[PDB]
Design a protein around this ligand. Structure first.
Ligand SMILES: CCCCCCCCCCCCCCCCCC(=O)OC[C@H](COP(=O)([O-])OCC(O)COP(=O)([O-])OC[C@@H](COC(=O)CCCCCCCCCCCCCCCCC)OC(=O)CCCCCCCCCCCCCCCCC)OC(=O)CCCCCCCCCCCCCCCCC
Ligand SMILES: NC(=O)c1ccc[n+]([C@@H]2O[C@H](COP(=O)([O-])OP(=O)(O)OC[C@H]3O[C@@H](n4cnc5c(N)ncnc54)[C@H](OP(=O)(O)O)[C@@H]3O)[C@@H](O)[C@H]2O)c1
Ligand code: SF4
Ligand code: SF4
Ligand code: SF4
Ligand SMILES: [Zn+2]
Lengths: 45, 208, 111, 319, 152, 71, 376, 90, 57, 176, 114
């Protein structure tokens, strides 16, 4: 979470490797997130 | 009565009462009923022979200009012994007032078109032909607007069931895009919402 | 002035005597309509109150008040086309009594 | 069991299973089964994209896709378990550089005459050709006769079909001609002796099946498809140039899908108008279509407007 | 082999490096696509340039609502597109027609005309569930044309 | 006849059931005549209904509440 | 392609280079609208007015709710009127961003499209925070606003609307004193006569050419008399001086927003008498009389007395009128919509003759034609 | 810096109303639990239906229709003209 | 004028397809869903058509 | 009232014509106009980097559907038939049955995700507070045979999160 | 019958009007067969027209015949010009649609009383 010097691009995430049967790093679909950061990544609270 | 109830005024309820009193007094060949709407609007029933003159009386005058045609529409009504209902609507730009012209009709009886009086009703009259089948006489260009090239139902009337007859599809049997009989994948349930006890006592029909 | 307000009209040219011709141009026609109509009974009344205010007083601006047309070129056009109504008013006969009453149950709305 | 109109979105009882169904013959069948509406389980070999033009035929949940190699047993024993009929049209033209081509018409129609037969299917159907004869022709034309004979051992009642030669819309038979804009037009072989065969129209062969698919009582009674009116001449090749006025392959090109400097030049001129005691098309009614009505359509080269059609043939003799 | 199936790690990467969409902006899902070309969730320069001509495009995007009087003009335009063509329908009216599913003048579904790959649901999908839609289309490209000519 | 649509599709179905997950509740006891159950917390859950608990052998889970309620 | 992104097939028997005959074809998006409202109730058929334009969201449903309150004899409560103006005069900063950008994209200027939509996304944020959703919000009801707007939006409209007059100070330097765009638009499509009123036009392509009139200060809506502003007029009768209404109305809409933040009375939102509004969720959950008016107001609708009506508001390109015949029960009779595009586009055939073909694409952008609204 | 005043020699100069609100003066959240009152005749002993009556109003009053020195009265007094709005009318 | 009096029975055709001779209509007075007791549901003659098959999708 | 725009004559003297004839001929406009207003490229671009960064939303957002349940499970639905009577698009398809314990429940529950016009009329008609428009726009399946929802999809889709949903409704039930 | 007619008066101007437009359609069969690039035989297009006019010969009334004229007069706008893109014309020739039984015993196997 950035230094409060942005908005919209101030909550960036990183993916790593193979959540539940994926490739190394060359398949990131964006639906891998846990259903708790939906309350956070989308700036909803 | 209270808050959250519309306040009326007797000013416009008296002026629009008094104004259109003498639209039945000075053309009593055509006008056969005039009634005042409770929300300060005017309706005036006109025999379909007076389709052109009572517009033409209004169209230019010193006391009632009504130079803007806002809305031409049409309503169909079964059980009337004369089906449809043509409703004209005009705007007094000098005076800020409204008046509606309600002319009844039938299917086969033509109506003299209001093309020469207002050139606004060119497209408002090709349309009504497509949607009901009223044949407006001597129209300078009568055509097929808002429908496909294959409809023969005039669909906005009560005899055309909601989904059509001609549900379309594609096939590779040659190359074409071809019609079919209608084939739904759900019933379109028809609910029943008309509840008894006759909640409105003022508008009550005569007993018989 | 050079702008007549409403574009499509033109300042050409003379007020105060272009009008008073066109009122009395209609008054000759207004006498012809066979007098039992209420149409003559009102239309004679609206032109006389007009012209008695019109003829003949400066300014151009003062004629705009007390005769509630728009600007002066458009005040011409309120009376210019009432002539074109008037000669049509002889042709059909609004003053005759009523024809072809609808069949006694048509204007009864809640079915 | 059936219900309602058979226009679309009905049930119609049958649950087919149509193998192949990507080529010119197999595709046009499934179009008429995606109308009356039925679980037409179509499996395909190795083609995800090349079958995409097949999906607006099955309404919603009518068709279903599976992958299968063909030589392995259970890959064709998994789709044949829930079925009513199953028809076969698998095969190709020339021997490939991976397969063997011999038992592909012997073991592979038998690999789906395996426990498929046992599991409870009925009305299993194979195909034939009007020229496949065990006399010494050809490497493809015979060894189809092995498939006429060596696969007949299992399923002693099939109604194997024996259609005529086909002219159609996207075919290869007639289209092998008029694609010979080339350094010369060489006929086979500068002679008009036995030309021509019976070019039956592809809508009739796909109408014969769907009248046989609930006939009933057509099992074991093999059929042979009548052609047009009536025989034809060598004038055909002149008639093709009369009105013409002179999938999943690769990424750039497939370097070998050839015109086959082999048996293929004589795989079509061996005619053998076979037994007229076969029942075989009109009793599988009702269909009888000429050539001179449907000849304008599929022949299409660079004039594209002006045809001025008057070219015809008498019968020809031995009519 | 290892020689041939390596080559579709380029061609099936070249085919997904630059898609050129035609769009059919017909109704309200036109505008909520134009905000994706607006530089907030900027559509271009994440791989995929915006609109071109019907002769040059790869992957068309149907939006809006297909009536009867647009049904032949769709299928004609679908023909001119090249061989590696794909169809995406956005909008909840190219999925079975939103509402107006029961009124006479709507082709009920837009799969009944063309074969469509990725369905995206929502009255207007928020240009946020459409980048997730096309990033499903790039993940669809894991196919190969090798091991087809090299198997059979 | 119907089971071919999930050949190689794993047939995703529910795992827990609430057909009977009522019974693991320690059914509440009060020693009174009528009790309220706006169950699930205030301003959420089903509306407040008053149940008579005098008989064999429980309130009746309110009609809404599901949870076995008694004295 | 995109002359309105794939609609409007028109035939042009062009006289050499000039057009002199032009007759378009509509009906490529017809959908069967007015047939289909007869089979719904009043509250249930409300989100098919929101989809009747595209870009006006709260300007439609402002002229449906006001056309049903008349039939009911109910006024909205006082806070419910200063919400409708804060939205009904914030969609007039959306319908005028599009008419001055996509017009200038058909002509060929690239950036002011991108320069404004990057800024426009600060304002589709504001729908989501109040209603719940992105564009089509079912928010206005026939008894006022659905629910209250959250704690906020007055430190966020105020930060926004104090910095919009610089963004509209960019288009003045892009377009107005620009020469090439002035050359593309002067004295083009001059329909100015009283055939430009015989055709029954609504606003701009009126008042931008002559006749000063609009239905916001010659008729009332709401508590809307209590604001002050002026109505921009045009001098000559062409596109460049009906362009300049749309630039000038956006400056005057900032004045009606800044006058609206100061005046909102705290109070209720829904109409109180509960035969029209549903009650609170914390009210239908304790008392008994609240379900019978929550349940039965969702199986059947209201009961509205019979008799026709008509109305008109000032939609940001014209009018929006409803002729809503109600029979007397929960499902209405005919509901005829009046929208522009019947007036604004029947009067193109007069407007186009004499000029080039490349003048014709310059004409159409100034009427701000939005289809699905030619479904009138 | 040199890239700062180059933006001040071109297109005016703002530096305060930047396009992105990504910087400061951006509102974070809101704290309190909201409470909303119910005012217009919600209470008892006077506030009461049959005085509240938001419906049940009569039919449109018809005027004399089928089955006197009138001064030709207009529907309304005509529209008086407008001002010219002294902010910057030209 | 040209009012051309005569008498000929008005019958229209062309608009539906084949459902003229296949379907007999039915005019009835609806009668009071008996679980309640309000009689506003009466007082209007209606018509209603035949019912046909409803299979399962 | 009024306002007049583009109603002004030129000055037409000796001085200001050279002010205008410096414009047409030597371009005092069109460089001072738009060789400077454009560049002005020196601002920071505002691009959401989508697979990692995501955009702002609001706790009343509309999206994927769900069916909640009580503390320890009861399948909060009671099949009272209102969420199906005010769908404007007639998506919901409920068929109840008296379940064996005595409390009534659903058997089949079907929501099309294509006829779903995304009102929020199911969300607010429910008395027992069950069916909730949940805040996740994750979608984009590849077959029309899939977007038809059953009952036992929605519960799975409604118990993949309830930490997401119940944080939203507790913030927002105070208004409605 | 107190209603003015459309075009005709009584049975004679009408039944020369309907014979007028038949000579238009008989002329404008072999034009559209190449104006749309459709490949059938030209005698098919003439058979459909002489089929279509015999359909309506049960009329005993004027201004009903005149109503059918207006529909028949209108189609020569679209058909003689190019407004139907090859597909709205070919709907008169039901090539795709399966044959109906129209005999009693074949209905009884398939279909619950159509
Ligand atoms: C190579 C790209 C890699 C890279 O630069 O690192 C990324 C790196 C990213 O770091 P960052 O934290 O994102 O930078 C943000 C700065 O605040 C942003 O830095 P900036 O945008 O403020 O640029 C700084 C500088 C850079 O300007 C220049 O490039 C100097 C001119 C080239 C001379 C060689 O601009 C100037 O002000 C110098 C002007 C020189 C005077 C011109 C004569 C006028 C005098 C009379 C008045 O960017 C930089 O290094 C910035 C300097 C770029 C220099 C360009 C390279 C020239 C060779
Ligand atoms: N009755 C006639 O007049 C006639 C004429 C010519 C040929 N035939 C034969 O009758 C059938 C008609 O087929 P067609 O006209 O549509 O042409 P086709 O190109 O042979 O299509 C038949 C399908 O079989 C597939 N295929 C080839 N080898 C296969 C294998 N080992 N396993 C699985 N599939 C294989 C082919 O490619 P894919 O594997 O990619 O699917 C093709 O899709 C064929 O068997 C053909 O050889 C008949
Ligand atoms: S239903 Fe959806 S796709 Fe159709 S117009 Fe409305 S928002 Fe657009
Ligand atoms: S959520 Fe409410 S409306 Fe929907 S089925 Fe359950 S109880 Fe009925
Ligand atoms: S969002 Fe609206 S249309 Fe969709 S299922 Fe819920 S109530 Fe029905
Ligand atoms: Zn409880």
């Amino acid at each position: 979470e950035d230094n409060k010097q942005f908005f919209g691009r101030h909550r960036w995430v990183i993916y790593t490797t193979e959540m539940n049967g994926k490739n190394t790093f060359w398949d990131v679909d964006g639906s891998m997130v846990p259903p708790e950061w939906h309350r956070w990544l989308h700036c909803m609270t | 009565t209270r808050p959250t109830v519309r306040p009326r005024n007797d000013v416009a309820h008296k002026q629009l009462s008094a104004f259109g009193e003498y639209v039945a007094e000075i053309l009593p060949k055509y006008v056969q009923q005039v009634q005042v709407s409770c929300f300060n609007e005017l309706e005036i029933c006109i025999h379909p022979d007076g389709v052109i003159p009572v517009l033409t009386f209004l169209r230019d005058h010193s006391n009632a200009q009504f130079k803007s045609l806002a809305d031409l529409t049409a309503v169909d009504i079964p059980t009337r012994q004369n089906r449809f209902e043509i409703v004209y609507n005009l705007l007094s730009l000098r005076f800020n007032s409204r008046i509606r012209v309600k002319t009844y009709t039938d299917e086969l009886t033509p109506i003299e078109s209001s093309v020469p009086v207002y050139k606004a009703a060119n497209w408002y009259e090709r349309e009504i032909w497509d949607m009901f089948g009223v044949f407006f006489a001597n129209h300078p260009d009568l055509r097929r607007i808002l429908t496909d090239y294959g409809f023969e139902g005039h669909p906005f009337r009560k005899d055309f069931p909601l989904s059509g007859y001609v549900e379309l599809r594609y096939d590779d049997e040659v190359k074409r895009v071809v019609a079919e009989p209608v084939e739904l994948a759900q019933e379109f349930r028809k609910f029943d919402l008309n509840s008894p006890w006759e909640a409105f006592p003022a508008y009550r029909q005569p007993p018989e | 002035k050079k702008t007549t307000g409403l574009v499509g009209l033109a300042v050409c040219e003379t007020p105060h005597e272009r009008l008073k011709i066109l009122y009395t141009k209609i008054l000759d026609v207004l006498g012809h309509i066979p007098k039992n109509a209420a149409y003559r009974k009102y239309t004679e009344q609206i032109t006389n109150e007009k012209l008695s205010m019109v003829k003949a007083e400066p300014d151009v601006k003062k004629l705009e008040e007390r005769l509630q047309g728009g600007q002066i070129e458009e005040v011409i056009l309120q009376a210019e086309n009432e002539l074109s109504l008037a000669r049509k008013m002889i042709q059909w006969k609004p003053w005759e009594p009523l024809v072809e009453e609808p069949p006694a149950s048509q204007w009864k709305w809640p079915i | 069991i059936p219900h309602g109109k058979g226009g679309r979105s009905s049930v119609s009882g049958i649950v087919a299973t149509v193998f192949g169904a990507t080529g010119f013959l197999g595709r046009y069948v499934v179009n008429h089964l995606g109308r009356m509406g039925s679980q037409v389980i179509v499996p395909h070999r190795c083609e995800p994209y090349d079958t995409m033009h097949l999906r607006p035929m099955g309404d919603l949940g009518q068709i279903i896709f599976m992958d299968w190699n063909g030589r392995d047993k259970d890959s064709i024993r998994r789709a044949v378990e829930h079925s009513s009929v199953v028809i076969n049209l698998v095969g190709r033209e020339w021997e490939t550089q991976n397969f063997d081509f011999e038992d592909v018409f012997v073991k592979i129609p038998q690999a789906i005459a395996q426990v498929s037969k046992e599991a409870g299917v009925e009305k299993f159907i194979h195909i034939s050709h009007l020229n496949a004869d065990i006399k010494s022709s050809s490497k493809y034309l015979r060894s189809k006769a092995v498939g006429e004979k060596e696969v007949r051992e299992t399923f002693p009642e099939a109604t194997i079909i024996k259609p005529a030669e086909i002219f159609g819309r996207e075919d290869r038979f007639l289209n092998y001609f008029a694609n010979i804009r080339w350094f010369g037009g060489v006929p086979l072989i500068s002679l008009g002796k036995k030309t021509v065969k019976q070019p039956v129209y592809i809508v009739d062969v796909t109408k014969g099946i769907i009248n046989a698919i609930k006939d009933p009582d057509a099992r074991g009674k093999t059929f042979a498809f009548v052609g047009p009116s009536r025989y034809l001449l060598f004038d055909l090749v002149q008639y093709v140039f009369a009105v013409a006025h002179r999938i999943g392959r690769l990424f750039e090109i497939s370097p070998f899908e050839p015109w086959t400097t082999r048996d293929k030049v004589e795989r079509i001129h061996t005619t053998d108008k076979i037994l007229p005691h076969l029942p075989g098309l009109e009793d599988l009614g009702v269909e009888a279509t000429p050539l001179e009505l449907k000849a304008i359509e599929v022949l299409r080269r660079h004039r594209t407007y002006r045809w001025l059609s008057s070219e015809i043939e008498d019968v020809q003799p031995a009519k | 082999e290892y020689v041939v199936a390596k080559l579709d790690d380029l061609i099936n990467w070249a085919r997904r490096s630059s898609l050129w969409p035609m769009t059919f902006g017909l109704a309200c899902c036109a505008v909520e696509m134009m905000h994706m070309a607006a530089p907030r969730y900027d559509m271009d320069r994440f791989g995929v340039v915006f609109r071109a001509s019907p002769r040059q495009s790869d992957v068309m995007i149907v939006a809006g609502t297909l009536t009867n009087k647009m049904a032949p003009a769709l299928r004609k335009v679908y023909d001119q597109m090249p061989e590696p063509r794909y169809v995406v329908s956005m909008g909840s009216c190219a999925n079975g027609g939103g509402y107006y599913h029961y009124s006479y003048s709507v082709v009920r579904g837009c799969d009944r005309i063309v074969p469509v790959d990725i369905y995206v649901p929502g009255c207007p999908p928020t240009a946020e569930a459409l980048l997730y839609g096309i990033l499903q289309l790039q993940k669809k490209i894991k196919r190969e044309k090798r091991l087809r000519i090299w198997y059979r | 006849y119907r089971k071919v649509r999930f050949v190689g599709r794993q047939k995703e179905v529910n795992e827990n059931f609430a057909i009977d997950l009522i019974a693991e509740q320690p059914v509440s006891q009060v020693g009174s005549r009528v009790i309220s159950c706006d169950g699930g917390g205030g301003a959420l859950g089903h509306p407040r209904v008053y149940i008579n608990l005098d008989k064999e052998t429980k309130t009746g889970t309110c009609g809404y509440c599901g949870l076995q309620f008694r004295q | 392609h995109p002359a309105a992104h794939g609609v409007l097939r028109l035939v042009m028997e062009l006289s050499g280079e000039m057009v002199r005959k032009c007759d378009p074809h509509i009906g490529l998006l017809h959908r069967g609208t007015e047939k289909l409202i007869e089979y719904k109730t009043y509250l249930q058929a409300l989100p098919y007015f929101d989809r009747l334009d595209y870009v006006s969201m709260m300007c439609n449903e402002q002229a449906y709710s006001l056309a049903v309150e008349k039939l009911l004899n109910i006024q909205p409560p006082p806070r419910a009127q200063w919400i409708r103006v804060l939205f009904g005069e914030i969609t007039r900063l959306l319908n005028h961003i599009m008419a001055v950008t996509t017009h200038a994209l058909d002509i060929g200027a690239m950036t002011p499209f991108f320069w404004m939509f990057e800024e426009r996304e600060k304002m589709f944020e504001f729908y989501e925070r109040v209603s719940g959703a992105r564009m089509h919000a079912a928010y206005v009801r026939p008894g006022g606003v659905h629910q209250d707007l959250p704690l906020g939006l007055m430190d966020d409209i105020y930060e926004f609307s104090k910095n919009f007059s610089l963004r509209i100070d960019e288009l003045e330097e892009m377009l107005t004193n620009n020469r090439i765009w002035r050359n593309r638009t002067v004295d083009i499509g001059i329909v100015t006569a009283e055939d430009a009123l015989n055709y029954g036009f609504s606003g701009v392509m009126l008042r931008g050419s002559g006749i000063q009139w609009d239905l916001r200060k010659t008729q009332p809506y709401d508590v809307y008399d209590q604001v002050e502003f002026d109505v921009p007029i045009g001098s000559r009768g062409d596109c460049y001086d009906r362009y300049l209404c749309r630039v000038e109305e956006m400056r005057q809409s900032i004045r009606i927003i800044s006058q609206c933040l100061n005046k909102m009375p705290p109070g209720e939102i829904k109409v109180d008498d509960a035969k029209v509004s549903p009650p609170k969720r914390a009210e239908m959950k304790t008392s008994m009389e609240s379900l019978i008016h929550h349940f039965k107001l969702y199986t059947e609708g209201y009961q509205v007395p019979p008799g026709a009506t008509y109305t008109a508001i000032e939609a940001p390109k014209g009018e929006f009128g409803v002729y809503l015949v109600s029979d007397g029960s929960s499902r209405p009779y005919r509901c005829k919509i009046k929208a522009p595009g019947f007036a604004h586009l029947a009067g193109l055939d007069k407007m186009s003759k004499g000029h080039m073909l490349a003048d014709v694409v310059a004409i159409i952008g100034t009427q701000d034609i939005v289809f699905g609204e030619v479904d009138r | 810096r040199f890239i700062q005043w180059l933006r001040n020699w071109a297109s005016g100069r703002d530096l305060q109303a930047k396009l992105q609100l990504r910087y400061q003066e951006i509102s974070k959240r809101t704290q309190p639990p909201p409470k909303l009152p119910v005012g217009p005749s919600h209470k008892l002993s006077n506030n009461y239906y049959c005085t509240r009556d938001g419906r049940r109003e009569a039919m449109p009053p018809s005027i004399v229709m089928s089955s006197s020195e009138k001064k030709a009265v207009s529907p309304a007094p005509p529209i008086k003209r407008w001002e010219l709005s002294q902010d910057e009318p030209y | 004028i040209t009012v051309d009096e005569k008498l000929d029975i008005t019958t229209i055709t062309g608009v539906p397809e084949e459902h003229i001779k296949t379907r007999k209509a039915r005019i009835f007075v609806p009668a009071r869903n008996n679980m309640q007791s309000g009689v506003n549901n009466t007082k209007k003659w209606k018509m209603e058509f035949d019912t046909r098959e409803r299979w399962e999708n | 009232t009024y306002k007049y725009v583009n109603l002004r004559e030129p000055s037409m003297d000796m001085k200001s014509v050279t002010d205008r004839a410096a414009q047409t001929l030597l371009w005092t406009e069109l460089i001072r106009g738009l060789g400077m207003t454009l560049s002005y490229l020196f601002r920071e671009p505002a691009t959401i980097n989508y697979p990692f960064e995501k955009g702002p939303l609001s706790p009343r957002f509309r999206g994927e559907h769900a069916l909640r349940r009580y503390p320890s499970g009861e399948e909060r639905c009671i099949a009272c038939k209102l969420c199906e009577a005010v769908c404007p698009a007639q998506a919901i398809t409920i068929e109840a049955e008296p379940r064996a314990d005595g409390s009534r429940r659903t058997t089949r529950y079907d929501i099309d995700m294509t006829k779903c016009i995304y009102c929020g009329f199911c969300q607010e008609a429910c008395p027992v507070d069950a069916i909730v428009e949940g805040p996740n726009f994750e979608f984009s399946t590849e077959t029309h045979e899939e977007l038809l929802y059953n009952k036992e999809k929605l519960l799975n889709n409604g118990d993949k999160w309830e930490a997401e949903i119940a944080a939203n409704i507790q913030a927002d039930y105070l208004y409605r | 019958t107190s209603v003015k007619p459309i075009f005709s008066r009584d049975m004679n101007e009408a039944k020369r009007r309907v014979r007028e437009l038949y000579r238009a359609w008989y002329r404008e069969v072999p034009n559209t067969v190449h104006l749309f690039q459709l490949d059938i035989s030209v005698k098919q297009g003439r058979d459909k027209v002489r089929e279509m006019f015999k359909k309506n010969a049960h009329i005993t009334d004027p201004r009903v015949v005149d109503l059918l004229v207006i529909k028949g007069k209108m189609e020569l706008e679209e058909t003689i010009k190019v407004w139907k893109q090859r597909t709205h014309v070919m709907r008169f020739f039901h090539e795709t649609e399966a044959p109906r039984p129209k005999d009693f015993l074949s209905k009884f196997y398939v279909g619950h009383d159509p």
